[PDB]
């Protein structure tokens with residue numbers, strides 16, 4: 399190729415590599431230097447940054463030299479090893495995105511059961527298996543295909559994957575590395591968004607009715623409580639309540655906690671309440687029949703009265719499962735509950751009557767940094783890997799239709815995912831953005 403083309407491509411690919419190596423190092427150092435970033439989900443982000451660092455420093459630079467030189471000069475053994483390192487790191491990134499998606503899925507859908515298992519030790523176990531599965535699946539086929547076929551069909555001065563020669567096998571790998579992971583992650587995201595907004599509404603409902611307290615207080619029984627009726631301990635000690643609070647959050651709070659930390663505790667209490675409802679033979683048929691809004695009004699009653707208290711409304715529960723909401727509203731209002739808390743009872747009864755949030759006046763979806771990051775890193779994956787996967791799709795129906803140049807650009811677009819991944823964290827998380835700025839200004843300072 400021309401000397402002018404060699405300089406132009408080397409500069410663009412070089413600057414892209416520099417942006418990839420810098421961004422993923424900044425992401426890794428951020429989790430290392432900042433304690434507030436040292437969360438179980440950020441262990442997977444560190445693992446993803448490791449895969450993206452190989453892509454930036456090794457894959458990108460070595461693939462660009464291969465295109466510029468127009469041939470492979472390092473030999474057949476260096477070639478297959480280079481391709482093995484490349485494919486395993488690229489798949490490890492996809493596996494890490496699946497780990498981020500599943501962790502976010504189980505922590506939102508199951509805040510009680512899953513957070514018993516959500517320790518850093520289990521995150522490290524899942525990270526290692528993800529990297530090991532990527533290796534066991536792609537490296538043996540990359541290196542030993544030539545021995546199983548009986549010949550190395552890749553010429554000297556050429557470096558490419560031998561088993562990806564036929565377009566149907568390329569499509570097979572595309573299904574396993576793109577089409578199936580994307581489908582799985584999208585289905586997981588629709589469930590995470592629906593669950594998050596559903597739980598938020600229960601949180602905002604009880605914030606109006608029961609009340610939210612950021613500091614440790616004593617309940618009616620005299621036990622230390624926090625947030626929306628979250629029991630810390632039954633022990634008559636302030637320090638014991640503080641120790642149990644620091645255990646539940648993971649930091650030295652010393653009495654005071656944030657709204658988001660109180661929401662985390664409340665969602666464990668919602669899971670504990672729903673566990674009791676399904677285990678109660680008198681509350682299970684009505685709960686299964688009610689919609690998301692009317693289920694929350696039943697949970698509201700469980701948080702105030704208790705399991706057996708709501709079960710006392712034999713007449714009312716029967717009319718709610720029969721979808722006769724005007725009838726059940728009359729029986730619910732004619733009780734000791736309505737007389738004790740008239741303002742709260744009317745709001746809950748109206749919720750059962752209408753099946754809407756008109757009694758409370760609710761705000762739109764508060765898209766938390768974690769939800770925004772997941773959506774950004776998933777869209778980043780779809781955007782950068784779509785060109786190559788469309789080329790694979792047209793390759794199956796069109797033999798040798800895709801030119802050498804297009805494959806080279808489609809390969810380079812897949813690597814751009816590694817460049818834009820730390821940008822997604824910076825754009826969605828304020829704690830990452832500030833640490834990125836902090837580390838960059840600290841590096842410029844000698």
Ligand SMILES: Cc1cc(F)c2[nH]c(=O)n(C3CCN(C4CCOCC4)CC3)c2c1
Pocket residue numbers: 456457458460461464470480481484485488557558559809812
């Ligand atoms: C480092 C290196 C050196 C070379 F000489 C290469 N030759 C060659 O064809 N590649 C490909 C580059 C793209 N990569 C993708 C495939 C889709 O999944 C994400 C990774 C597969 C190997 C080479 C890579």
Ligand SMILES: CCCCCCCC/C=C/CCCCCCCC(=O)O
Pocket residue numbers: 460463464467469470471472476477479480483
């Ligand atoms: C086991 C891990 C795999 C890594 C080992 C593969 C060998 C890679 C060697 C890289 C040396 C860099 C030389 C740069 C010139 C490239 C010239 C070319 O081949 O076109």
Ligand SMILES: CCCCCCCC/C=C\CCCCCCCC(=O)O
Pocket residue numbers: 429430436441444445448452525529
């Ligand atoms: C050729 C080089 C390949 C190296 C890949 C190694 C596999 C990556 C392993 C995972 C890194 C561990 C992630 C957890 C770090 C915790 C960060 C912290 O909070 O201190």
Ligand SMILES: CCCCCCCC/C=C\CCCCCCCC(=O)O
Pocket residue numbers: 472473474475476477479553554555
């Ligand atoms: C775990 C780290 C291992 C990485 C070591 C990399 C060493 C690669 C060395 C060069 C291999 C060249 C061997 C000659 C192959 C034949 C060349 C040809 O087909 O023209």
Ligand SMILES: CCCCCCCC/C=C\CCCCCCCC(=O)O
Pocket residue numbers: 479482483486487521522523525526527529530533537
């Ligand atoms: C021959 C190709 C060479 C490529 C080497 C890089 C590929 C990574 C391979 C698998 C190692 C598995 C990583 C396990 C480390 C555990 C890290 C942790 O979770 O703390």
Ligand SMILES: CCCCCCCC/C=C\CCCCCCCC(=O)O
Pocket residue numbers: 410801802803
């Ligand atoms: C950031 C954007 C910059 C993009 C840089 C990459 C530019 C590469 C573009 C393609 C030029 C095409 C090269 C000519 C190949 C001819 C092969 C043929 O005739 O089939």
